[PDB]
Design an enzyme around this catalytic site. Structure first.
Site, PDB file in Angstrom:
ATOM      1  N   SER A  97       0.933  -0.961   0.532  1.00 37.07           N
ATOM      2  CA  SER A  97       0.445   0.300   0.038  1.00 37.07           C
ATOM      3  C   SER A  97       1.299   1.383   0.067  1.00 37.07           C
ATOM      4  O   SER A  97       1.855   1.361  -0.614  1.00 37.07           O
ATOM      5  CB  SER A  97      -0.987  -0.016   1.166  1.00 37.07           C
ATOM      6  OG  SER A  97      -1.967   1.088   1.451  1.00 37.07           O
ATOM      7  N   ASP A 237      -4.731   5.287  -5.585  1.00 32.39           N
ATOM      8  CA  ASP A 237      -3.068   4.117  -4.840  1.00 32.39           C
ATOM      9  C   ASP A 237      -2.641   3.660  -5.273  1.00 32.39           C
ATOM     10  O   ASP A 237      -3.377   3.032  -6.396  1.00 32.39           O
ATOM     11  CB  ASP A 237      -4.285   3.367  -2.953  1.00 32.39           C
ATOM     12  CG  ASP A 237      -4.596   2.155  -3.244  1.00 32.39           C
ATOM     13  OD1 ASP A 237      -5.711   1.874  -4.014  1.00 32.39           O
ATOM     14  OD2 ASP A 237      -5.297   1.794  -2.212  1.00 32.39           O
ATOM     15  N   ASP A 239      -2.184  -0.319  -5.216  1.00 32.01           N
ATOM     16  CA  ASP A 239      -2.382  -1.287  -5.569  1.00 32.01           C
ATOM     17  C   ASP A 239      -4.299  -0.962  -6.149  1.00 32.01           C
ATOM     18  O   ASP A 239      -5.164  -1.965  -6.240  1.00 32.01           O
ATOM     19  CB  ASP A 239      -2.468  -1.952  -5.026  1.00 32.01           C
ATOM     20  CG  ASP A 239      -3.464  -1.895  -3.544  1.00 32.01           C
ATOM     21  OD1 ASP A 239      -4.014  -0.846  -3.015  1.00 32.01           O
ATOM     22  OD2 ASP A 239      -3.193  -2.698  -2.285  1.00 32.01           O
ATOM     23  N   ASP A 241      -6.665  -0.077  -5.107  1.00 26.62           N
ATOM     24  CA  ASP A 241      -8.456  -0.521  -5.237  1.00 26.62           C
ATOM     25  C   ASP A 241      -9.183   0.863  -3.923  1.00 26.62           C
ATOM     26  O   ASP A 241     -10.321   0.766  -3.533  1.00 26.62           O
ATOM     27  CB  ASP A 241      -8.322  -1.818  -3.747  1.00 26.62           C
ATOM     28  CG  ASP A 241      -7.808  -1.497  -2.794  1.00 26.62           C
ATOM     29  OD1 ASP A 241      -6.755  -0.467  -2.821  1.00 26.62           O
ATOM     30  OD2 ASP A 241      -6.794  -2.358  -1.937  1.00 26.62           O
TER      31      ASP A 241
HETATM   32 CA   LIG Z   1      -5.193  -0.407  -1.844  1.00 24.80          CA
END
Ligand SMILES: [Ca+2]
Ligand SMILES: O=P([O-])(O)O[C@H]1O[C@H](COP(=O)(O)O)[C@@H](O)[C@H](O)[C@H]1O
Length: 448
Positions: A97, A237, A239, A241
């Site tokens: 993250s 962000d 990744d 999500d």
């Molecule tokens: Ca994320």
């Protein structure tokens, strides 16, 4: 003690003292013992060390007789989607993250991408890993590389009527995370004109670790929107999500307002549906869900509670104010891609700008934004707040911390499940002055 990397919702820690390849392999072994039968989906983010942690997970899983489906460099939602779509026993996304450069982590799910959390298997895994001194076994199962994203891309596009889409100009900002790969795979199927910012995946992060909430990162998307006359901008962000929206003026839209907006968008396709929301900021979502013919369902914040509540209610959509959006048809999982497709469709169909879609709602239910307080004594601090307001006799709710409804204003005050902080959210019925005076009053009490 106990392994610090195992948190309430995921694994995250500094490499190599809190997380490393040996721990990752042991996690794979322990995970094999927790799951029902079937293969395990593995994917990873752009961090330089993520592939080696995935390979160690794979070695431990395969030593335990689990077939591994390697989906490669991906977003977290692709691990969720493929775990459910392929009817796998579970999945792991290796992701850091926005933690520092020497950190990494993992998010684990079981069947149908259901979360594995501290009290639903993650601490059991931790305890197994902690006691595991066994020699590493050798692989007794295979790994398959699954690069095909067709079903995932078709699923994303199924949320919109492509013939109704207009050629909007959209700024897209991957922040050098992974979102640009999916944008580029979607683009041949969409009429939009993309303005690509920080688009190439680069785990060295020449423009900073992806985090659109930091003002200097936020401003890069705003500037690209204003300088190019874009209809709106989207940032993710690392990744992907989480997604973040900027209107045509460059203004970042506070995530609270996206819950009601996305709910109205979804309810147009699934009439009468239930919509799950968190307790931090509520009034706007309740009204917008009801106005669109849906039924709002209050739920404790946190993806595990949200997803479980959505499942038990057959809820079509759930949203948190902190840029998490969950969709029943997406295995009840969160996506950073579905939301901007829905918003692009709503702008295209309605003829209204994103700004206009939210403007009146922001004026009607202004909010403080989430304000965090590191205090010496959270319990005593909360008590000081509640004692101060007791003579006003607010309606109290304990779904998630303390929610206090005074009539024309309300607040929620929570201890975090991811940090040892107090988090405050205040909103009012169309009164910016009351919002500020009450926010400042509470802030003074918390810091006293
Ligand atoms: Ca994320
Ligand atoms: O921040 P993420 O992306 O890891 O998200 C995680 O933490 C967030 C903040 O939780 P809290 O307010 O207790 O700190 C939750 O809302 C979210 O559902 C959870 O998946």
């Amino acid at each position: 003690m106990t392994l610090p990397a195992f948190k309430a919702y995921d694994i995250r820690g500094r490499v190599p003292d809190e997380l490393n390849e040996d721990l990752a392999r042991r996690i794979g072994v322990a995970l094999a013992a927790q799951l029902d039968q079937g293969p395990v989906v593995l994917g990873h983010d752009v961090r330089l060390a993520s592939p080696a942690l995935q390979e160690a997970l794979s070695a431990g899983l395969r030593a335990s007789g689990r077939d591994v489906i390697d989906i490669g460099l991906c977003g977290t939602e692709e691990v969720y989607f493929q775990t459910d779509y392929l009817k796998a026993a579970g999945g792991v996304m290796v992701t850091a993250s926005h933690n520092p450069m020497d950190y990494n982590g993992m998010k684990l799910v079981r069947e149908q991408a259901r979360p594995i959390s501290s009290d639903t298997g993650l601490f059991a895994i931790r305890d197994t890993v902690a006691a595991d001194t066994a020699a590493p076994g050798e692989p007794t199962a295979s790994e398959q590389s699954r690069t095909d994203k067709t079903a995932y891309l078709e699923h994303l596009l199924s949320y919109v009527d492509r013939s109704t889409l207009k050629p909007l100009k959209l700024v897209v900002n991957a922040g050098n995370g992974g979102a640009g790969l999916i944008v580029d795979l979607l683009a041949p199927h969409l009429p939009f004109e993309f303005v690509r910012v920080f688009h190439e995946p680069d785990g060295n992060f020449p423009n900073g670790i992806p985090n659109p909430l930091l003002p200097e990162n936020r401003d890069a998307t705003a500037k690209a929107v204003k300088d190019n006359g874009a209809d709106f901008g989207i940032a993710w962000d690392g990744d992907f999500d989480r997604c973040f929206f900027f209107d045509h003026t460059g203004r970042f839209i506070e995530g609270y307002y996206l819950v009601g907006l996305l709910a109205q968008a979804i309810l147009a396709k699934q009439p009468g549906g239930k919509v799950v929301h968190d307790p931090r900021l509520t009034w706007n979502t309740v009204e917008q869900v009801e106005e669109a013919g849906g039924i709002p369902v209050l739920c404790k914040s946190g993806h595990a509670f949200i997803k479980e509540k959505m499942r038990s209610e057959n809820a079509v959509y759930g949203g948190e104010m902190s840029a998490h959006h969950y969709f029943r048809e997406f295995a009840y999982a969160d996506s950073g891609m579905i939301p901007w497709l829905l918003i692009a469709e709503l702008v295209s169909q309605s003829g209204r700008s994103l700004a206009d879609l939210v403007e009146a709602r922001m004026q009607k239910f202004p909010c403080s934004g989430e304000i965090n307080f590191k205090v010496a004594d959270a319990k005593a601090s909360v008590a000081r707040v509640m004692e101060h307001y007791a003579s006003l006799s607010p309606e109290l709710d304990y779904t998630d911390g303390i929610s206090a409804d005074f009539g024309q204003w309300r607040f929620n005050l929570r201890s975090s499940n991811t940090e040892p902080l107090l988090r405050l959210n205040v909103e009012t019925r169309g009164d910016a002055a009351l919002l500020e005076t009450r926010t400042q009053e509470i802030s003074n009490l918390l810091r006293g």
